[PDB]
């Protein structure tokens, strides 16, 4: 299958026509996405098969063909870019300054950008173009808008 580094759409033909259920990042021969997108299921890339390698429902992440490769973190100060890949629309970079998700186990960066659930898995980048996390797991605030965590895995 196609193994070039970059951002990919995650699609299905099990509903009406072709539907985009999410997005993912190919880096170092490993495909990275959010768990709620695939539910840990195998993926096809042309005539090739990508099998899951690591996953965790609580972190809401899954990697294919190898272990999680993305280790960059938000520095807590600079603006970042959501490389949004919306359904039926072209990839588009949106700059924002992340807010915070305060939890009992520590603070996490969060992006206050609202895209449909089919955009889940779109990468968030730092100034050198490194992936600091994936968009798509968050909360609905008072005004009904979506605020997503900057979700990053651990590189072994």
């Amino acid at each position: 299958g196609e193994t070039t580094d970059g951002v990919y759409r995650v699609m299905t033909r099990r509903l009406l026509g072709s539907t985009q259920v999410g997005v993912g990042v190919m880096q170092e021969g490993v495909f990275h996405t959010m768990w709620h997108v695939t539910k840990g299921a195998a993926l096809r890339s042309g005539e090739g098969r990508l099998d899951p390698y690591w996953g965790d429902v609580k972190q809401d992440l899954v990697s294919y063909c190898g272990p999680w490769k993305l280790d960059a973190a938000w520095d807590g100060l600079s603006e970042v870019q959501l490389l949004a890949v919306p359904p039926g629309e072209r990839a588009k970079n949106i700059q924002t300054l992340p807010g915070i998700f305060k939890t009992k186990d520590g603070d996490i960066g969060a992006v206050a950008l609202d895209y449909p659930a089919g955009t889940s898995g779109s990468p968030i980048l730092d100034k050198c173009g490194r992936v600091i996390g994936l968009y798509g797991n968050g909360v609905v605030i008072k005004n009904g808008s979506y605020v997503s965590a900057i979700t990053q895995g651990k590189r072994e």
Binding site: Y8, R9, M26, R90, N93, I100, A110, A112, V139
Partner: protein, 39 residues
């Protein structure tokens, strides 16, 4: 069955559209990976 399709390169774009605010929200993360608001 699910399939992947390339959508682009991962690069920072100079002069991109700048939008969105930076709210500080108290949240909880359950065993199923769902965030919720603690108010």
């Amino acid at each position: 069955d699910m399939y992947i399709e390339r959508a682009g390169d991962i690069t920072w774009e100079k002069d991109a559209e700048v939008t969105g605010n930076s709210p500080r929200l108290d949240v909880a993360l359950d065993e199923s990976g769902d965030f919720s608001l603690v108010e």
